[PDB]
Amino acid sequence: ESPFVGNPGNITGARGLTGTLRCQLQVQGEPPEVHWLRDGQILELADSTQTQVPLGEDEQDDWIVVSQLRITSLQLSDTGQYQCLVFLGHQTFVSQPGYVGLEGLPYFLEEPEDRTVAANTPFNLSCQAQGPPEPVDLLWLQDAVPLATAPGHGPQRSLHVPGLNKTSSFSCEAHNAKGVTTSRTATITVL
């Protein structure tokens, strides 16, 4: 049968998060080195830690191996189906799979910038923001005031201001299933 007894679990979180996957097999004599497979391919450069515990009286009896892959600053690429692999002779063995997915608050790509415009003149501000998860609804604010009933409603990614007879400020919330992340407060200076 399959040497495994414990299969990888699942880890989902925001970018940056460090977490760990772990499988634990039991073999007969001198344990094999356990490798990690991500999306069916071999993970050549990854932080892993194998713990071997001899159950017998010699190194030729039963052993308990437990390998845990650790993902440090969780980014996008690290996303996928992960599984353990051990070679028992010319034969090969794989663990059930585990999946790791990225999922947190909105990430800004563009935020309202500071500007200094002539009075009663038109101009535009921008506000992009990616997920996952998607979709992400935007929502502007003027002098700390919503410019729409709720997120997703009103201008988004690009807000056109007809004119300003005095210095004002704009923010830009970004919402998604996880929560909300507000942008920096841009200050428009009038002359």
Partner 1 sequence: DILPCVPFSVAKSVKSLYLGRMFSGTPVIRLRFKRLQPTRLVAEFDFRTFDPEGILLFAGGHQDSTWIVLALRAGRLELQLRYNGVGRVTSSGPVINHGMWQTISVEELARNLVIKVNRDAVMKIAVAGDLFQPERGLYHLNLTVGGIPFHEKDLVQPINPRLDGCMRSWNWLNGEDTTIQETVKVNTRMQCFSVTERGSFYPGSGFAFYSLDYMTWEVEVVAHIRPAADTGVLFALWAPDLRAVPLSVALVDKQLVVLAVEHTALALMEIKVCDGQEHVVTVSLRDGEATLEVDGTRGQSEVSAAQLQERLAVLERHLRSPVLTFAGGLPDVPVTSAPVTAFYRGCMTLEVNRRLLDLDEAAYKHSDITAHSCPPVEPA
Binding site for partner 1 (CB under 8 A): 13-14, 20, 22, 24, 33, 44-55, 57-59, 64, 66, 68, 72, 104-105, 111, 144, 173, 175, 178-185
Q: How many helices (H) and strands (E) does the chain have?
A: 0, 18
185 close to 110: Cβ distance less than 8 angstroms:
no
Residue 21 or 164: which CB sits closer to partner 1? 21
Residue 122 or 143: which CB sits closer to partner 1? 143
Question: How would you class 162 by CB atoms within 10 Å of its CB: exposed for 0-12, middle for 13-18, buried for 19 or more?
Answer: exposed
Residue 129 or 159: which CB sits closer to partner 1? 129
Site pattern 83..122 for Ni ion (x: CB under 5 A): -------x--------------------------------
Which among 64, 76, 65, 66 has a CA at the least distance from the CA of 20?
66
The CB density around residue 155, as the number of other CB atoms within 10 Å, is 17
Q: Among partner 1, Ni ion, none, what does residue 117 contact (CB within 5–8 Å per kind)?
A: none
| Residues in touch with Ni ion (CB under 5 A) | 90
